[PDB]
Amino acid sequence: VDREQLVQKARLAEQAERYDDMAAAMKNVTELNEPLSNEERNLLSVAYKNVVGARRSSWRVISSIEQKTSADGNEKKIEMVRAYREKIEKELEAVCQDVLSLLDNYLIKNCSETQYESKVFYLKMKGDYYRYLAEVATGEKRATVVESSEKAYSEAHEISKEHMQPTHPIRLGLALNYSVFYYEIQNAPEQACHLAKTAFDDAIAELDTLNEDSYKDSTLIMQLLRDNLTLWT
Amino acid sequence: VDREQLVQKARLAEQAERYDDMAAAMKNVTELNEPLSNEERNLLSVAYKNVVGARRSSWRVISSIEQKTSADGNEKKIEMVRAYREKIEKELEAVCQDVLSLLDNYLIKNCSETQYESKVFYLKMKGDYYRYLAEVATGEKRATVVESSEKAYSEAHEISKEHMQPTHPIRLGLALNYSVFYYEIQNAPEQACHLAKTAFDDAIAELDTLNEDSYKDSTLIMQLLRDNLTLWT
Amino acid sequence: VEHSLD
Predict the structure, then answer these.
(1) Annotated site (Interaction with phosphoserine on interacting protein), which positions (chains A, B)?
(2) In total, how many domains does chain A have?
């Protein structure tokens, strides 16, 4: 099958903002067991991020309307709100299952010992979507998705701590989502501020290490870390 | 499921930005063979305007690349863009013939001959979605949907000039889209300007008839008429 | 430029 034409279809779907098609194409490319380039890695991530992102946004809107109109007595209406929340959750959980199965069976598995850039990217991606499941999970299932999210983030943090410079956009972006994981899922603003402050301090100290084609992205995440730090302190 | 629940799901789908479900909900309300209130009328219009609008934006992006890739000459890449532009075209056409089905079979049919505000609303809506078909049609297929678009508009313009106030937002909005039809579809700037200016002049001549409620919507359309006039002249 | 009603 024409692999390059499948990647061309993904780039076309991105400009048309048809992220459902873009995810389907990049999944087809991933299923050919060929390693994903840096551009194709982002095409896959951006596609599924917008797919699951649309569901995460709708879920928060429905949950907030379910909580603001709970003490109203309109039993027939809130029953319809819970069903709509449950429908979006089933869509949200199905999207996370598709990416996590791709990562554990196609992407993380086929990773050489030298290409650590893909390892941190997929592992942070793995912890990202395990965190997305934790946002809607409750009870015993919520404890499981939290541990798998923590496991994927910790393994990505260890690898990025050894082979990646503090100014690397992947290592910086991992600390952002890791701190967000600890502030919104673990309810631990202390440990969340530690992850954000340590990565921001290590990057500012080694600020004389960035080039033209990476300074724009590295400093962009450092502002997101600084904005989150002042919001959590 | 009760009718009030379907309308509640549509309002819920709107806040969650799930415009596909919003259209399916308001389509279920339409299929009840009962007239739509002024609120439910706008809920159905807003829903399908976002659904077809998402495929209008995607088509223009892909079609522009299709005219840009024609200089490449890669038959494998040209046929892939052509096939994708065709797939979005089919989705855009299916949505349009879905709205036109509801308009002809349920909405315009169940409109009492004494209710002119809803008849002009639906006839303008009918001319809008035949204009969206003409945006992507060629040859005799385009000439057919252009003739149908002009017929729905002209029928709506004649009813509004006899039973509606010149400052009414629905009559003002109809003349705005009708003038756009002459400019973007028929390429008649003189006819587009004569229609936009006349509706602007008629509203100014009877500006005292501005309703204490709908004057905010009437003044915005009057501004859009002069914005198009200064842009086309 | 799609100068229609929004």
Answers:
(1) 56, 131
(2) 1
Contact (CB, 8 A) for A43 and A11 = yes
Asked if A36 contacts A107 with a C-beta cutoff of 8 angstroms, the reply is yes
User: Which structure tokens are listed for A98?
Assistant: 């598709």
- A81 contact B CB<8A: yes
Determine the length of chain A: 233
Question: Which positions in chain A touch B5 (Cβ < 8 Å)?
Answer: 76-77, 80
| Alpha carbons A93 and B187: distance in angstroms, whole number | 49
Asked if the Cβ–Cβ distance from C4 to B227 is below 8 Å, we say no
Token reading at B164: 């509606």
Distance set, CA A91 to CA A59, A67, A88, A96, B107 (Å): 10, 21, 5, 9, 33
Find the domain containing A120 and state its range: 1-233
Q: Which residues of A touch B65 (CB under 8 A)?
A: 12, 15
HSE toward the beta carbon, residue B80, CA cutoff 13 A: 20
Q: What is the CATH number of the domain that holds A40?
A: 1.20.190.20
Cα–Cα dist A143/A145, whole Å: 6
Residue A126: φ, ψ to 5°: -65, -45
CA distance A129 to A165: 25
